[PDB]
Design a protein around this ligand. Structure first.
Ligand SMILES: CCOP(=O)(COc1ccc(C[C@H](NC(=O)O[C@H]2CO[C@H]3OCC[C@H]32)[C@H](O)CN(CC(C)C)S(=O)(=O)c2ccc(OC)cc2)cc1)OCC
Lengths: 99, 99
């Protein structure tokens, strides 16, 4: 389908047995979510944007369900003010920009 | 046209008669550009980002070409890691997300 940009493109994802609302974000390289518990090992990382950098825990190979699809990608967990779905995951579900 | 998300969706914009590189950012409500000179008077605006709030200069009804399409709207100038084109301008050129 087609998602308009008149409003923030919000979606509900299923990850780690939880339902989280996030922003389909083309300006986000990776998916970044607020504090939550995830399985497996992780690596500390610093990501920057408007306002500066924040420290996050990088988890790889995380299964996430979005728009009915079951994709796999990297999830950065940290004190982000808004949950965002990055290009890392959007590519997997075949999402593109069109005009 | 269609823009995939495997790489950052960087496009050429024209503002003030100069060509610049900007990132199509669906996670951004507004358009924030790196330090530059724009005509007329500006108003103050406080915008939030992943690292916190920052003060920017707000210029309205500014002519700006994005991917060759003409738009006239609000441009915010301030400390941003990269020029970002937000939903305010992407809506003007009829851009949407699709899958
Ligand atoms: C301090 C509190 O702020 P806030 O009011 C809004 O909180 C955010 C934070 C981040 C974003 C995504 C970025 N958009 C944004 O900042 O938008 C700005 C401009 O429009 C305005 O409206 C939304 C917030 C203004 C952008 O899409 C992606 N970023 C990169 C680029 C902007 C430099 S990012 O989030 O820094 C990022 C994501 C993934 C990464 O992986 C490597 C790296 C970096 C949206 C909203 O809190 C609400 C509770």
């Amino acid at each position: 389908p087609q998602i308009t940009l008149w409003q923030r493109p919000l979606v509900t994802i299923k990850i780690g047995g939880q339902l989280k609302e996030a922003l389909l974000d083309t300006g986000a390289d990776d998916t970044v979510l607020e504090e939550m518990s995830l399985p497996g090992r992780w690596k500390p990382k610093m990501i920057g944007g408007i306002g500066g950098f924040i420290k996050v825990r990088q988890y790889d190979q995380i299964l996430i369900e979005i728009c009915g699809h079951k994709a796999i990608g990297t999830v950065l967990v940290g004190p982000t003010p808004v949950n965002v779905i990055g290009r890392n995951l959007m590519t997997q579900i075949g999402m593109t920009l069109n005009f």
